[PDB]
Design a binder for this molecule. Structure first.
Ligand SMILES: NC(=O)c1ccc[n+]([C@@H]2O[C@H](COP(=O)([O-])OP(=O)(O)OC[C@H]3O[C@@H](n4cnc5c(N)ncnc54)[C@H](OP(=O)(O)O)[C@@H]3O)[C@@H](O)[C@H]2O)c1
Ligand SMILES: NC(=O)c1ccc[n+]([C@@H]2O[C@H](COP(=O)([O-])OP(=O)(O)OC[C@H]3O[C@@H](n4cnc5c(N)ncnc54)[C@H](OP(=O)(O)O)[C@@H]3O)[C@@H](O)[C@H]2O)c1
Ligand SMILES: C[C@@H]1CCN(Cc2ccccc2)CC1=O
Ligand SMILES: C[C@@H]1CCN(Cc2ccccc2)CC1=O
Ligand SMILES: C[C@@H]1CCN(Cc2ccccc2)CC1=O
Ligand SMILES: C[C@@H]1CCN(Cc2ccccc2)CC1=O
Lengths: 288, 290
């Protein structure tokens, strides 16, 4: 039984706690709301009064909090991380990973690795589970056996910030897929159709879209914006989604997409493909 | 003689793809386009170019329309006053009510029948059996046009209701607009960070097919009004905010504004603990641009 500490017992933190218990370690936990540890006490888990007491109990510290800001608040009075390895599974930006790595190095930590869990809690540890890890290969290799408790890990880079970079890119795709899906189900539901029958009809079409993504990535890399689906036509179809929604009394998402396509047309990029939109983003810090 | 007579109105990206599919399947084609020069590649293959929309419709018993919009369709059919003995196949993207408006316009003018279709692939994939076109309108009219329409791929008759193909088109294109908004954001981030877009597409591929798998479960939750799970909107909104900050760190713009705005309002209305299924009632109960 290796000693492990866990900071954070939210939806994901409790899923992590159960995986670590199942795999046979001596777990110490801390959470702002100590009552979230109730389901772990029967399984032989120690609840530490403070973040400092939690970190003192183990050589390996797992963190799964809401955000970077909560992480820095929680680590404020954790003064001695000498001989400790930090595994940070908290979502944030590439620079926020560098900021926590620096905070823990300043306090004597042996090593920092960052992970992005890419499944909901119920899939953690199951065969469908993937976690992206970044940081020094020797530190990943040191932790690989512990980390197997939460499912498959993918070492994506020795650069501490890269798991968060890739996390933020993949969650952009997830955000967009869910924005389109919520809009779709709102339309079909208000129109009196069955959402589950709609999902069956849709799923072929959605897997076809996923097959197009690598061709689009190649066009973006190669700056090849010519094809058979110009932004003028795409924008006309997005405008018809708004009017379909208005006709039904349903609200309208995809506003940022309409605004960036509208400006692309004004810049004379109306004849380009969807690849044409990437340069609209890469050259200007703006919320569309 | 042998080959069926077919008229096509519109020779844009998709209209030209249709023209080539109809030629290849062995039909006798008459075309009209605002820009007559778009027919140059069809004239060798033996197609007739009509001077006006009316003369085009006069040449054939079956009329295919593939124009930009309803507004352009209405304008283009302004002087098409006689549709007696003509079946109308409208493949122009528009709203459910615009499909009803065109069906009524062509009835008034004596059309035999009207079906609406939504092509769900780019022009280069038209004619592949795997390319699906959704068709709505009278079953008998669809069944009589099924052999002609097999030129452009596999057709799926979704409803006798003329407006249904456009309803389902607008819903499927909502998903495509979302997917592409997220994909453009993702490629802007990884590109500006100096990563390879093509290796990122490969890394991403598993993760995106996993999401398609989650959609029927979410649809069930929305139908059953089950909004409780392990991925609360407060946590999802924090992650979306970190996409904005990641982008700002790279000097890159940010999309997904409507998604941040509707999740913020959910959190404000006490639905911060709910799953993504909890957003659907935010849309269904209020006409609003987020
Ligand atoms: N849930 C998922 O589906 C999912 C999937 C992939 C990744 N993740 C990532 O996992 C991380 C944790 O998310 P979660 O789903 O566990 O979120 P959650 O259920 O909302 O839990 C958030 C955690 O942060 C703590 N926290 C929030 N504000 C705090 C504060 N001001 N001070 C101290 N602690 C505070 C909470 O403590 P209390 O219990 O006291 O509120 C809880 O431990 C996030 O970075 C998220 O992006 C989640
Ligand atoms: N990937 C795709 O291209 C795709 C996929 C699925 C469905 N669709 C649907 O197919 C339809 C046709 O799109 P497309 O790709 O062919 O677009 P496109 O290449 O922009 O062509 C638009 C067509 O409409 C004509 N047009 C535009 N404004 C006009 C006006 N004011 N008066 C008369 N004609 C006018 C154009 O004539 P000119 O040639 O003279 O400009 C052209 O024939 C759309 O409803 C679209 O949503 C397209
Ligand atoms: C697959 C899981 C499911 C919850 N996701 C939370 C989330 C964050 C941002 C946008 C949508 C969903 C993180 C994941 O990667
Ligand atoms: C709207 C987007 C623009 C890029 N297209 C890429 C593509 C995919 C398959 C075949 C050709 C082009 C897919 C689309 O329809
Ligand atoms: C794949 C093709 C590309 C043009 N599409 C129009 C469109 C509309 C909204 C958002 C993106 C693309 C329809 C399609 O099925
Ligand atoms: C962020 C969204 C919220 C609904 N989730 C549905 C889901 C998918 C698989 C297993 C459980 C729940 C997927 C997500 O992660």
């Amino acid at each position: 039984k290796p000693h492990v500490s866990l900071i954070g017992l939210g939806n994901m933190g409790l899923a992590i706690a159960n995986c670590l218990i199942k795999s046979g370690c001596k777990l110490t936990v801390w959470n702002r709301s100590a009552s979230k540890a109730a389901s772990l006490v029967a399984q032989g888990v120690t609840v530490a009064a403070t973040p400092a007491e939690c970190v003192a109990s183990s050589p390996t510290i797992v963190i799964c909090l809401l955000s970077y800001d909560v992480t820095q608040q929680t680590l404020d009075e954790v003064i001695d991380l000498s001989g400790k390895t930090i595994i940070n599974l908290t979502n944030g930006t590439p620079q926020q990973a560098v900021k926590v790595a620096t905070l823990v190095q300043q306090r004597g930590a042996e090593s920092y690795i960052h992970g992005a869990i890419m499944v909901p809690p119920i899939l953690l540890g199951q065969p469908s589970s993937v976690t992206l890890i970044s940081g020094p290969k020797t530190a990943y290799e040191s932790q690989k056996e512990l980390l197997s408790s939460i499912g498959t890990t993918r070492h994506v880079s020795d650069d501490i910030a890269k798991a968060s970079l890739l996390d933020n890119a993949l969650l952009s795709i997830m955000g967009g897929v869910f924005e389109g899906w919520v809009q779709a189900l709102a339309i079909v539901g208000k129109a009196g159709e069955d959402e589950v029958d709609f999902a069956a009809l849709a799923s072929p079409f959605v897997k076809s879209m996923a097959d197009w993504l690598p061709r689009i990535a190649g066009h973006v890399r190669e700056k090849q914006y010519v094809g058979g689906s110009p932004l003028t036509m795409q924008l006309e179809a997005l405008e018809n989604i708004s009017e379909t929604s208005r006709e039904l009394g349903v609200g309208v998402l995809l506003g940022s997409m309409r605004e960036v396509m509208s400006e692309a047309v004004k810049k004379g990029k109306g004849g380009e493909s969807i690849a044409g939109l990437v340069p609209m983003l890469t050259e200007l810090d703006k919320k569309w």
